[PDB]
Design a protein around this ligand. Structure first.
Ligand SMILES: [Zn+2]
Ligand SMILES: [Zn+2]
Ligand SMILES: [Zn+2]
Ligand SMILES: [Zn+2]
Ligand SMILES: [Zn+2]
Ligand SMILES: [Zn+2]
Ligand SMILES: [Zn+2]
Ligand SMILES: [Zn+2]
Lengths: 92, 437, 91, 92
């Protein structure tokens, strides 16, 4: 069906590979300054909307923070995820 | 205009047995999150019980049952509606969400400070929240005169998370055998912390005057780096004096010290000799450090200065070799001196004023002896020198939570953007461990 | 790119990936025995890399600038107190 | 409609990224909610693009017109002389 995703994640976790991907992504985002950019954006958005309500603030921040990920980080980590999936999935 | 509290948890807390149940469960959830290995943590706290996805946004751990549910497909929200359990703990950060308010509960001290639940009446009556003005410890130190080599260093210590935790934990205070801030350096440093963060013509200079008084009693030069070394040695000496069994601990461990200095700032360098033929590491010598002094001549970047510090120098049959310096053990806080002051043989002094670019996050993997994983430090402090080796002036810049930088120029404390901070001529850099893969 | 047929059967078997996709019966509260057995863990400071590259007695604060310093001020003497030092001080 | 290595890889990355954003934003919003509840009259630290005024919006004080009372000798001492003064005074 479409529990493919959840079964692939289970494999990635159990094999040790999810940890690798997760840490690699975090190390890259941190070093390129994206973590601190998202924190700035968040503060700025709280000021703008005069609110600390999480649901409201997230709806303005998340779309922008997704787009702020550098091309290099995004396409490197996607390639690294594909390569792990190439080992375990059949295609047609 | 007044900010309000989640009305739902307030209602729950009208019953004291319920309040205690909530606080027990919050403590339990947080404990588990700090005591689960990464795989367990993914499979058991970050896996949605409805869709079974890992990290479908935040995953929340229910207060009232064992269910975990995701954000992105609104599965915890469905649980709160279906079953009536409206509270869950985010398994990334331990924060408590009200799914009726659609917000976190972040402004109740009891829940934030839940580990003291059993003592909360005593805590509440006998302590208060920091005052607005002192909450970040920001205050200037007057130049009293040619004392900016001391005050610049003190601002970096006072804004260092490890020292501030040490001091506020009362560890020195509980054990000190002198108990007087005009004699004990460590007691003087505690007094400065007291003044800057708590409550004890000019203001908030008392602890600093005490320290000068202590300094004198040892006895009174020019160099902020030398005062850094002086002051960390005093903190160590005071730990050793306060032990019951200093002789014995040294014999047993010897050359391991458990003081705040030696468990935070100390690493070690490995000096090695290696056969070019086969790469047999024949011979290593390990030596401790409290900071790394780097040559900057003809360089533009901090990573070039480290590359130079780390460079290779000068089977059948291993001794007829190459020498290399690398890091054997890293410290929790890495401190870097960029060597800028020359003292020539004719008694004259020269200042190297070269700009050296230094990063907000520093990866030390390429400098550790040995594949080395990413080991990434966050820049939190800079001391800058301006002018001549002897007739010059030190300023400190410290980063606090949220990422604002502050400039400390004697009594003047000002806000400064990161862009401007990164253009400073760094003399000392203070880096704190942030991520280890 | 290429369309997925499925997870390799061998991988399904090795890793026991077949899971009846009704709601889970797990409880996070069941983790407590294992958690009590387990030494303090960091979210992103790998325990095995810490043993290799840092001192065994290192003090470690994960994400020390995550939030402002968490303290309260003694009403008697005005000292700033770490949360874990308050009870002892009040004596 | 059509499930590929690339679409699943992108789903995996989006899980990692939205989680991390949702974490950062939650930490920001709770902290600010606390500060604003704790201090209803909270002010930002003053920022001066021209680099003249301090965090309270004030000019640098002239440190040589200030004095400190020396507890060793009971005199007022000009603040910028205190360290020289102490050399002479503590020796007494
Ligand atoms: Zn779900
Ligand atoms: Zn529930
Ligand atoms: Zn609520
Ligand atoms: Zn003392
Ligand atoms: Zn020591
Ligand atoms: Zn050889
Ligand atoms: Zn007290
Ligand atoms: Zn005097």
């Amino acid at each position: 069906t479409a529990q493919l995703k959840s079964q692939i994640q289970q494999y990635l976790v159990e094999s040790g590979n999810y940890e690798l991907i997760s840490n690699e992504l975090k190390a890259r985002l941190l070093q390129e300054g994206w973590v601190d950019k998202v924190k700035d954006l968040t503060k700025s958005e709280m000021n703008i909307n005069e609110s600390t309500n999480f649901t409201q603030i997230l709806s303005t921040v998340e779309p922008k923070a997704l787009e702020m990920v550098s091309d290099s980080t995004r396409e490197t980590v996607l390639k690294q995820i594909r390569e792990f999936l190439e080992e375990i999935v059949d295609t047609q | 205009a007044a900010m309000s509290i989640c009305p739902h948890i307030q209602q729950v807390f009208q019953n004291e047995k319920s309040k205690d149940g909530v606080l027990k469960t919050c403590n339990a959830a947080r404990y588990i999150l700090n005591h689960s290995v990464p795989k367990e943590k993914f499979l058991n706290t970050m896996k949605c019980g409805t869709c079974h996805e890992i990290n479908s946004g935040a995953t929340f751990m229910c207060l009232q049952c064992g269910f975990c549910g995701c954000w992105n497909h609104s599965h915890f929200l469905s649980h709160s509606k279906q079953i009536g359990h409206i509270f869950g703990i985010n398994s990334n950060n331990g924060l408590l969400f009200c799914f009726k308010c659609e917000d976190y509960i972040g402004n109740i001290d009891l829940i934030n400070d839940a580990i003291l639940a059993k003592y909360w009446d005593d805590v509440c009556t006998k302590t208060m929240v920091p005052s607005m003005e002192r909450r970040d410890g920001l205050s200037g130190l007057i130049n009293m005169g040619n004392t900016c080599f001391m005050s610049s260093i003190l601002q970096c210590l006072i804004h260092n998370p490890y020292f501030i935790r040490h001091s506020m934990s009362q560890i020195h205070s509980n054990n000190c055998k002198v108990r007087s801030p005009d004699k004990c350096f460590s007691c003087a440093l505690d007094k400065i912390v007291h003044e800057l963060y708590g409550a004890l013509s000019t203001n908030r200079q008392t602890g600093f005057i005490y320290l000068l008084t202590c300094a004198w009693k040892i006895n009174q030069q020019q160099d902020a780096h030398e005062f850094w070394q002086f002051i960390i040695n005093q903190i160590h000496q005071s730990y050793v004096l306060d032990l019951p069994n200093a002789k014995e601990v040294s014999r047993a461990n010897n050359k391991q010290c458990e003081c705040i200095v030696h468990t935070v700032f100390e690493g070690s360098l490995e000096s090695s000799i290696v056969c070019p033929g086969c790469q047999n590491n024949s011979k290593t010598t390990i030596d401790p450090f409290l900071d790394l002094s780097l040559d900057i001549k003809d360089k533009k970047k901090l990573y070039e200065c480290l590359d130079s510090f780390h460079k290779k120098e000068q089977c059948g049959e291993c001794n007829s070799a190459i020498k290399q310096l690398g890091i054997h053990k890293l410290p929790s806080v890495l401190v870097l001196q960029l060597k800028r002051f020359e003292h020539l043989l004719n008694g004259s002094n020269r200042k190297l004023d070269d700009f050296i670019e230094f990063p907000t996050y520093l990866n030390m993997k390429n400098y550790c002896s040995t594949k080395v994983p990413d080991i990434i430090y966050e820049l939190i402090g800079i001391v800058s020198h301006k002018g001549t080796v002897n007739e010059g002036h030190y300023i400190a810049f410290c980063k606090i939570s949220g990422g604002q930088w502050f400039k400390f120029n004697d009594s003047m404390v000002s806000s400064i953007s990161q862009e401007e901070v990164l253009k400073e001529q760094a003399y000392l850099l203070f880096y704190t461990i942030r991520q280890v893969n | 790119d290429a369309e997925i047929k499925g997870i390799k059967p061998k991988v399904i078997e090795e890793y026991s990936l077949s899971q009846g996709s009704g709601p889970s019966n797990d409880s996070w509260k069941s983790l407590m025995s294992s958690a009590k057995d387990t030494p303090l863990q960091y979210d992103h400071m790998n325990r095995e890399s810490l043993k290799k590259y840092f001192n065994p007695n290192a003090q470690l604060i994960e994400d020390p600038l995550d939030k402002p310093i968490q303290y309260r001020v003694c009403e008697k003497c005005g000292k700033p107190l770490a949360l874990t030092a308050i009870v002892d001080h009040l004596e | 409609e059509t499930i590929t290595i690339d679409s699943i890889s992108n789903g995996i990355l989006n899980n990692l990224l939205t989680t991390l954003i949702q974490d950062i934003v939650a930490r920001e919003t709770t902290q600010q909610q606390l500060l604003k509840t704790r201090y209803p009259d909270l002010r930002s630290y003053y920022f001066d693009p021209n680099g003249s005024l301090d965090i309270n919006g004030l000019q640098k004080q002239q440190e040589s017109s200030q004095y400190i009372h020396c507890e060793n000798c009971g005199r007022d001492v000009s603040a910028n002389r205190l360290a020289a003064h102490l050399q002479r005074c503590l020796s007494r």
